[PDB]
Amino acid sequence: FSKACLKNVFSVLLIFIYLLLMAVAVFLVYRTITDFREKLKHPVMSVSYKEVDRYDAPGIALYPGQAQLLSCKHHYEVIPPLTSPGQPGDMNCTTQRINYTDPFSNQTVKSALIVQGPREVKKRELVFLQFRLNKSSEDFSAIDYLLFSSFQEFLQSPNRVGFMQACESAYSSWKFSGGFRTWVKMSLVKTKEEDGREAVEFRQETSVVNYIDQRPAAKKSAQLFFVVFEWKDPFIQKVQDIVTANPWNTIALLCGAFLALFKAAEFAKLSIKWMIKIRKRYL
Amino acid sequence: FSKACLKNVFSVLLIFIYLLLMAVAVFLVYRTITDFREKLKHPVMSVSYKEVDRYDAPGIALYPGQAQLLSCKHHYEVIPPLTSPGQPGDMNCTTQRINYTDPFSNQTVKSALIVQGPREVKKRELVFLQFRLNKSSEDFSAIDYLLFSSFQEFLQSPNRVGFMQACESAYSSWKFSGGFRTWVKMSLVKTKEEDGREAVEFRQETSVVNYIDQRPAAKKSAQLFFVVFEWKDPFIQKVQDIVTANPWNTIALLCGAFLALFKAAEFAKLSIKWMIKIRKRYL
Amino acid sequence: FSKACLKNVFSVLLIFIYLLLMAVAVFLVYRTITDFREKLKHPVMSVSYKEVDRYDAPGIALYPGQAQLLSCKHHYEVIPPLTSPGQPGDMNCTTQRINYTDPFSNQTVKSALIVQGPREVKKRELVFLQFRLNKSSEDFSAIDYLLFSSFQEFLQSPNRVGFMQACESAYSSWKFSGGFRTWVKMSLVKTKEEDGREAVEFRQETSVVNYIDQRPAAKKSAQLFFVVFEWKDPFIQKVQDIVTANPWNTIALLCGAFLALFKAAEFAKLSIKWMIKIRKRYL
Ligand SMILES: *[C@@H]1O[C@H](CO)[C@@H](O)[C@H](O)[C@H]1NC(C)=O
Ligand SMILES: *[C@@H]1O[C@H](CO)[C@@H](O)[C@H](O)[C@H]1NC(C)=O
Ligand SMILES: *[C@@H]1O[C@H](CO)[C@@H](O)[C@H](O)[C@H]1NC(C)=O
Ligand SMILES: *[C@@H]1O[C@H](CO)[C@@H](O)[C@H](O)[C@H]1NC(C)=O
Ligand SMILES: *[C@@H]1O[C@H](CO)[C@@H](O)[C@H](O)[C@H]1NC(C)=O
Ligand SMILES: *[C@@H]1O[C@H](CO)[C@@H](O)[C@H](O)[C@H]1NC(C)=O
Ligand SMILES: *[C@@H]1O[C@H](CO)[C@@H](O)[C@H](O)[C@H]1NC(C)=O
Ligand SMILES: *[C@@H]1O[C@H](CO)[C@@H](O)[C@H](O)[C@H]1NC(C)=O
Ligand SMILES: *[C@@H]1O[C@H](CO)[C@@H](O)[C@H](O)[C@H]1NC(C)=O
Ligand SMILES: *[C@@H]1O[C@H](CO)[C@@H](O)[C@H](O)[C@H]1NC(C)=O
Ligand SMILES: *[C@@H]1O[C@H](CO)[C@@H](O)[C@H](O)[C@H]1NC(C)=O
Ligand SMILES: *[C@@H]1O[C@H](CO)[C@@H](O)[C@H](O)[C@H]1NC(C)=O
């Protein structure tokens, strides 16, 4: 039967058309919900992890001040013994020197030394830094450092000063002591704001290790700073609005609501007929 | 047609009534599920973050023991250089002194100094504390401290002693060393128990910094304790039962199940008619 | 009416049969989705917490090297003052000594001392370790340690060497300094891979505390290492694929999709009749 086959194929096509129409309606309702959500402030946010084979190269903005960088080197899961503490050399890191006004206190300019961070988390790649300071007039010996998402973004940024101020606004600033080697295991946390930008903040697990110096007492006045940066785990924590992070839950809820509405329509159509029949039988 | 319009509006009203009835049934089923869940112990819990513009003022319960508080001051994202280490003055913090019996070991009473914590996370507000100890007979120089949810709750609590014991039961106790300035970046984690109470625990990221003292050798016997408390990020981690944390997923699942049951009812109504017709045709 | 009751009970049985068939179809579709997901690499993973009354005993693999273990003891929420620093005795921990080749650098063999960790988190059980080293030729004084999921698994493992290499592959290695007592608050994080194995990694919150020594200057050459291990909180972080972690969301979405397809089928059946009637009326 050619007519029967034509009717069947047209019915299948109409099934496709109505399924597409329902999908479009659900998508429009979900987009309306998202647009209404993004307006309100402080929404409930969910957590999602995503393992990465290789990390993007981060930026480690040091603040030596009067301290001089002594040595920078990349290593894998082990630190070879130092040839001679307090001596320069063996320095090759992608270091960019920029200094700018502090966004918090506009009166002070801070000198930032940005060093490209490790990126092969699987190989336990780490970066070892050494600093020296002959004379210091301060109660506490420390160097400030903050971590931002990517070194490449800073390198190719059009407004370098503003990018560093935005990084200062981010909550990823710490310190490492003098006379100690601190192993910093940094973790990446990405949060997506409602406006669209993805703010990035870091989490660290320091391991302070005392440094024993056999150098002559003449050079004991100078203090040596050591720090090691390494990725703790390949997993990247992602924070996003609970509705937007997993839209499939909202889609399922909306489909359930629409199907419930249609079932209620069918129930009303049956019930009006039933009550009309009852009224006709009674009177 | 007045009758047609009346029938249509009555049908819409009946749609509303049946939709409300379905919502009530789904709500009752969800409440039954929640009541059954809350009985079982150790449920699977989810994680939700919620950014806050301003933090509630926390309580930092120090345990100086023989140590004397030297100076307390609130600062913003920077610590001014100390005028004179080891000297009192410039002390203004909301400090409440209470001491009580240890819930773990009832034989020992512990002296707790509670200091109101920072609350403007956006401005990077921080609290700086100094302690002094002339003579000490101990292998390790440290001061215990634990953090609870709100200082105001402790201040207006009816049973002060019991509140501190409950805080001791909470897992938010740490230490900071002597001769070092430790920057404590505390994070708030709220977990909601099945009974209804919301237990609060803290997460910290210390940054130990060595302290260099130029004071005369006569006063070197006394040891100085420094600590800084600051909120790491405005986000507050919230932990709740997976079913209760996002009830919309359970509501969607229940609506889907009810609609599937109704579809099965329709399928049975069609299939019984089909098989009756088949049986009548055959015999 | 016996016939009416028989028809009703048969209709109920057919309802059960069709509900079971729908459940089987949804289960097959969900299993297909899971099998397709598990093939792709780097999926989005969710976070679930689960409180435990008691922890499984972990394994703390120390790396003293030339250092000699001085004392091991289990305590509850308090460390009694040391009877005499630098002296052995009071040693009773379940310690297993194994040494093997480093998976990263095959040329070096590492000596591992595994100590059973605390398990009563509710009682704040902790393990205190002491180490001694007379002569050392190294710039930094530290002992490596890594934490794996269970001590019992290592104890009864058939291939001990391979298990330790797998633990080394896990990202749970840290250090503790010399001359300081570091309080390690370890947290358990379980991640389930797509292949099926559950990798385990740890998170720690160290609390470095300076150690004051009154021992005679003759013995000051030797350095003493102190470390304390304790569970931070009973909650265990579990990381799993977002689809697999909460299958109920996927089941609800699939049921909604199938019900939407059936509703589209009904709409097509009505619309074809409506358009056929319209065409017949027109021509
Ligand atoms: C290492 O340093 C040398 C200069 O001493 C430089 O030419 C080389 O590119 C550096 N390699 C890396 C990977 O930094
Ligand atoms: C950085 O500081 C120096 C002075 O130390 C001065 O040249 C100017 O403020 C900045 N210059 C550079 C190199 O950006
Ligand atoms: C500091 O300088 C900046 C420059 O933009 C300005 O916006 C800010 O108001 C100033 N704050 C003061 C006056 O302390
Ligand atoms: C510090 O002292 C060393 C000693 O050799 C000297 O070479 C160097 O120029 C001095 N300046 C700094 C701060 O590096
Ligand atoms: C600061 O200290 C003075 C007393 O020296 C006190 O009157 C004032 O209220 C304090 N301010 C704050 C904010 O603590
Ligand atoms: C706190 O301790 C003191 C003794 O140091 C004693 O008065 C009593 O135990 C407590 N008193 C206060 C001030 O609560
Ligand atoms: C310690 O004293 C408390 C007071 O309530 C009591 O409950 C507990 O059993 C005591 N523990 C002992 C006797 O060690
Ligand atoms: C500690 O020593 C200082 C030295 O001036 C003295 O003023 C003070 O009374 C002593 N007592 C304490 C523990 O503060
Ligand atoms: C404590 O040490 C003794 C030997 O000195 C041993 O017999 C006993 O089993 C140990 N107890 C524990 C719990 O380790
Ligand atoms: C561990 O090391 C020792 C040498 O210190 C040697 O016997 C062998 O390499 C290993 N032996 C044991 C006890 O496993
Ligand atoms: C180190 O030895 C192991 C033994 O299995 C081997 O697999 C690996 O390739 C070696 N790496 C080298 C040659 O550096
Ligand atoms: C270290 O010195 C102590 C001093 O009594 C001695 O007993 C011991 O045998 C020496 N060896 C080690 C490394 O323990």
Author numbering:
A (entry chain A), B (entry chain C), C (entry chain B): 57 to 339
What is the paper's account of this structure, in its own sentences?
Proton-activated chloride (PAC) channel is a ubiquitously expressed pH-sensing ion channel, encoded by PACC1 (TMEM206). PAC regulates endosomal acidification and macropinosome shrinkage by releasing chloride from the organelle lumens. PAC is a homotrimer that forms a chloride-selective pore in the membrane, and it senses changes in pH via its large extracellular domain (ECD). PAC channel is closed at neutral pH and becomes activated when the pH drops below 5.5.
To reveal the mechanism underlying PIP2 inhibition, we solved the cryo-EM structure of PAC in nanodiscs with 0.5 mM diC8-PIP2 at pH 4.0 to an overall resolution of 2.70 Å. The structure adopts a conformation similar to the previously reported desensitized state at low pH. However, a strong branched lipid density is observed on the cryo-EM map of the PAC channel in the outer membrane leaflet, between TM1 and TM2 of adjacent subunits. When trying to fit a diC8-PIP2 molecule into this density, we found that the phosphatidyl group is reasonably well defined, with its phosphate group forming a salt bridge interaction with R93 and its two acyl tails interacting with a number of hydrophobic residues on both transmembrane helices, including W304. In contrast, the hydrophilic head group, such as inositol-4,5-bisphosphate (Ins(4,5)P2) moiety of PIP2, is not resolved and therefore not modeled. Nevertheless, the local biochemical environment of the site is consistent with PIP2 binding, in which the hypothetical location of Ins(4,5)P2 is surrounded by several positively charged residues, including K97, K106, and K294. Moreover, small, but notable, conformational changes are observed in the transmembrane helices (TM1 and TM2) upon adding PIP2, which supports the binding of PIP2 to PAC. The pore radius profile is similar to the desensitized state of PAC without PIP2, with the smallest radius of 0.43 Å. Therefore, the PIP2-bound conformation also represents a non-conductive state. When overexpressed in PAC knockout (KO) HEK293 cells, mutation of any residues R93, K97, K106, K294, and W304 to alanine significantly relieved the inhibition by PIP2 on pH 5.0-induced PAC currents, confirming that this was indeed its binding site on the channel.
